[PDB]
Design an enzyme around this catalytic site. Structure first.
Site, short mmCIF file in Angstrom:
data_model
loop_
_atom_site.label_atom_id
_atom_site.label_comp_id
_atom_site.label_asym_id
_atom_site.label_seq_id
_atom_site.Cartn_x
_atom_site.Cartn_y
_atom_site.Cartn_z
N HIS B 43 0.74 -1.25 -0.12
CA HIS B 43 0.12 -0.02 0.05
C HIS B 43 0.91 1.31 0.01
O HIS B 43 0.56 2.45 -0.25
CB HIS B 43 -0.92 -0.06 1.29
CG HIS B 43 -0.29 0.50 2.37
ND1 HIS B 43 0.20 -0.59 3.21
CD2 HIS B 43 0.60 1.64 2.90
CE1 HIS B 43 0.95 0.08 4.27
NE2 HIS B 43 0.93 1.32 3.93
N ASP B 99 0.19 -7.75 1.94
CA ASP B 99 0.39 -6.22 1.47
C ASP B 99 1.77 -6.55 1.69
O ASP B 99 2.42 -6.09 2.67
CB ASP B 99 0.08 -5.67 2.86
CG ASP B 99 0.26 -4.09 2.66
OD1 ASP B 99 0.65 -3.81 1.61
OD2 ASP B 99 0.09 -3.48 3.70
N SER B 198 4.91 2.37 7.78
CA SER B 198 4.25 1.55 6.88
C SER B 198 5.43 0.99 5.97
O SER B 198 6.18 1.74 5.36
CB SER B 198 3.20 1.93 5.99
OG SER B 198 2.42 3.20 6.49
#
Ligand SMILES: *[C@@H]1O[C@H](CO)[C@@H](O)[C@H](O)[C@H]1NC(C)=O
Ligand SMILES: OC[C@H]1O[C@@H](O)[C@H](O)[C@@H](O)[C@@H]1O
Ligand code: NA
Ligand code: NA
Lengths: 6, 252, 29
Positions: B43, B99, B198
């Site tokens: 992402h 992910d 992230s």
């Protein structure tokens, strides 16, 4: 603000 | 990183900063798994509802870093990417399942006191260490809170939380490709990954051989460091067959 | 293949300031 390379 | 502390020099020498060429900005974390490959969260690269779709020409990776903004002469390297590879069954529509993404450097990077890859786990190291209560480590230049941005790489050590607890604290559908980790309200201690973290690593140190292994990748959470909530991390061993398939054919 | 041994730590028999908490969590409980 980000300090530049080269 | 929230309720963390400053990394020590060289503490996390596989830690990688994902960096937008223009405008210049910090995108994510990532990790050095060999002289040719960086590991990150999908992402970070592709998220179609926010018009995210970074090709390789868009990004740079900075490796060896400590300070967030400074150009660390004689310590860091900067590399162009050759290609990006996102997991083909990456599920951005719902829950960010799978992910994960790979990124290949154009040139092999030289290792040093500051640039060293981390292990990926084997089935055994997986079994042994992925247990409720066993702690791992998250590093990142992400938000201090939900000023603001840290001055240096930040570190926190967090307990893995048992599946039922994880499941019962979000209203999102957990898959077996995720694990969650963080402390519970009655455990006192605080700590969580945050925006900007992230894609960065969740590592554990094996006591069988003294090597650090990346068991997870920062994927998502609801806010940051909220009581009764937990960081979700991408289960790296579960996806290791896709990791190897990609490397063997594009490792060159 | 030298994966995960840090030059500034493991390659020189130095521990960081918090890894023991990692190991305390593997043995205690
Ligand atoms: C993302 O970028 C690619 C490459 O430029 C483009 O062709 C495509 O339309 C975009 N969407 C994707 C990869 O889902
Ligand atoms: O705007 C969102 C954030 O603003 C910050 O100034 C606060 O410290 C955060 O906890 C808050 O959630
Ligand atoms: Na990573
Ligand atoms: Na919490």
């Amino acid at each position: 603000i980000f300090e530049p390379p080269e | 990183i929230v309720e963390g502390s400053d990394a020590e020099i060289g503490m996390s020498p596989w830690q990688v900063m994902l960096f937008r060429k223009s405008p210049q900005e910090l995108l994510c974390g990532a990790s050095l798994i060999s002289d040719r490959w960086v590991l990150t969260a999908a992402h970070c690269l592709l998220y179609p509802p926010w018009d995210k779709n970074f090709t390789e020409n868009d990004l740079l990776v900075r490796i060896g870093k400590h300070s967030r903004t400074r150009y660390e002469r004689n310590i860091e390297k900067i590399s162009m990417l050759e290609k990006i590879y996102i997991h083909p069954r990456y599920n951005w529509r719902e829950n960010l399942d799978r992910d994960i993404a790979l990124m290949k450097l154009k040139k092999p990077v030289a290792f040093s006191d500051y640039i060293h890859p981390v292990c990926l786990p084997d089935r055994e190291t997986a079994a042994s260490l992925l247990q409720a209560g066993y702690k791992g480590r998250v590093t990142g230049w992400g938000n201090l809170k939900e000023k603001g941005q840290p001055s240096v790489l930040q570190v926190v050590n967090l307990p893995i939380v048992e599946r039922p607890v994880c499941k019962d604290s979000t209203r999102i559908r957990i898959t077996d490709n995720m694990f969650c980790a963080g402390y519970k309200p009655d455990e006192g201690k605080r700590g969580d990954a945050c925006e900007g973290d992230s894609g960065g690593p969740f590592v554990m140190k094996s006591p069988f051989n003294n090597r650090w292994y990346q068991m997870g990748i920062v994927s998502w959470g609801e806010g940051c460091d909220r009581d009764g909530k937990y960081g979700f991390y991408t289960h790296v061993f579960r996806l290791k067959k896709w990791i190897q398939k990609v490397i063997d054919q594009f490792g060159e | 293949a030298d994966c995960g041994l840090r030059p500034l730590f493991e390659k020189k028999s130095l521990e960081d300031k918090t890894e023991r908490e990692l190991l305390e969590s593997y043995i205690d409980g």
